[PDB]
């Protein structure tokens, strides 16, 4: 639908022997295409999708150079944040960064994102105007001042409006057969006798992309919200996703129940029942 | 492509 690119940084300190670890992963929509991990013997940026493999060595050198320098900077950021919060060296701490661009109707930046977190909590975020910051607490304000003085917002805006969009567009062209293709769920309903007089109806959605999906059970058109067992959307391991929804129903009354499935790759409303 | 390095210093938190 509306396409996006996101990078995810995790920088983690350990109290034990060893330098802080930096991990980066890149996504186009729900597809991972790249990874970097500083823990490998000689860390290197690695392809995670086939359509990225066509990029030449210069691209990989450039990526690695960027991630190595980030690795060194984050080690310093971790020490700095330890100081702002007056924490000892005894604990393990984590900085997380999430940034990237959404593509607009006109092929330009719709909005940019650049949010950071410390120990699982919001720390600092770039505002929608890409010129100012929102800090979560007083410690983050120290970072804000430093970043305002160093004019970091300008640098991020340069990327979010420039290379983020250009490269996203290039990836979308190079990987169009998968990145611009929605895969409809394969759907079916299973029946499992849960006691003498009741039975579980399970509605399955398999092999779909993107992850976004809605599965809802109905009895005679009425929503069974409070009685529906609905698992979180999980990856299949082959870049598709799975989900199921279940209801416990009185035996012989299975025809009353309908499953409803909504997904981008489905151009019509889909309704299923159990089929013997 | 991730955010590339600036000409100047990469600023820590």
């Amino acid at each position, epitope marked *: 639908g509306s396409h996006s690119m996101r990078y995810f940084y995790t920088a983690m300190s350990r109290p034990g022997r060893g330098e802080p670890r930096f991990i980066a992963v890149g996504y186009v929509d729900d597809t991972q295409f790249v990874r970097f991990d500083s823990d490998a013997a000689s860390p290197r940026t690695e392809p995670r999708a086939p359509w990225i493999e066509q990029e030449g060595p210069e691209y990989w050198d450039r990526n690695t*150079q960027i991630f190595k320098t980030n690795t060194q900077t984050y080690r310093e950021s971790l020490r700095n944040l330890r100081g702002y919060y007056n924490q000892s060296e005894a604990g393990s701490h984590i900085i997380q960064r999430m940034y990237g661009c959404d593509l607009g109707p006109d092929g330009r930046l719709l909005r940019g994102h650049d949010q950071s977190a410390y120990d699982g909590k919001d720390y600092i975020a770039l505002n929608e105007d890409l010129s100012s910051w929102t800090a979560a607490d007083t410690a983050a304000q120290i970072t804000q001042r430093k970043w305002e003085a160093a*004019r970091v917002a300008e*640098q991020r805006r340069a990327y979010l409006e*420039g290379l983020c969009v250009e490269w996203l567009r290039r990836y979308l062209e190079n990987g169009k057969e998968t990145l611009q293709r929605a895969d409809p769920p394969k759907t079916h309903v299973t029946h499992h006798p849960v006691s003498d007089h009741e039975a579980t109806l399970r509605c399955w959605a398999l092999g779909f992309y993107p992850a976004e999906i809605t599965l809802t059970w109905q009895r005679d058109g009425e929503d069974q919200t409070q009685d529906t067992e609905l698992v979180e959307t999980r990856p299949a391991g082959d870049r598709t996703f799975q989900k199921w929804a279940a209801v416990v129903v009185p035996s012989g009354e299975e025809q009353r129940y309908t499953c409803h499935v909504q997904h981008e790759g489905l151009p019509k409303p889909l309704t299923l029942r159990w089929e013997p | 492509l991730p955010e590339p*390095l*600036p*000409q*100047g*210093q*990469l600023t820590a938190y």
Partner: T-cell receptor
Amino acid sequence: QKVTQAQTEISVVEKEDVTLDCVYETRDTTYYLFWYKQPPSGELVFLIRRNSFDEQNEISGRYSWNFQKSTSSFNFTITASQVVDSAVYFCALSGFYNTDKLIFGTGTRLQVFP
Amino acid sequence: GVTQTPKFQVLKTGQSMTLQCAQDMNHNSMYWYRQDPGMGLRLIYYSASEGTTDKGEVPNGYNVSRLNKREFSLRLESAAPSQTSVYFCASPGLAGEYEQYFGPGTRLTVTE
């Protein structure tokens, strides 16, 4: 990528206004521009940095800059010229990143006669 | 900001010499330029990071070395009279108002 300063020498008398032209070409969507001063002493002194997404007009005392993206120009105006302004002025263009190259114009010599 | 040695130099044609540039602002990038009367500043070589060098507009007759984050060396292996120029090291950033991004320049004359 190119920075053109068409003017070689400019001569004005004290108190006259002067405009130094800078035309540029870029492939990048995103870039920034410098103006530098080089007094007879030889050193380079920073005057201004303008990013491609910044505003058209800025005034710092007797200095002012007109950045026009659509005309690809970054004209530098000195109001009420003074002998102190005698120098060679350089316009420069550069992408935002470590891999990008800072490119300089041919420079323009300003002479402010009393 | 950035420093340079020496400030002045005389060389004989064929002789070697290395110009030193140092920068203690933890910049990623460093640039060598030559100035010639009417040509402006022309890029010789630049360095994007430690252990990485790339050719500028006029690399011919020059080599560079980026041994660490701080230092960027320009060498003339076999000096020619056409290399008579003023050399400038540069390390641009975002605080041009507070920091010096150009060295004071070195004046080099290669004579026969």
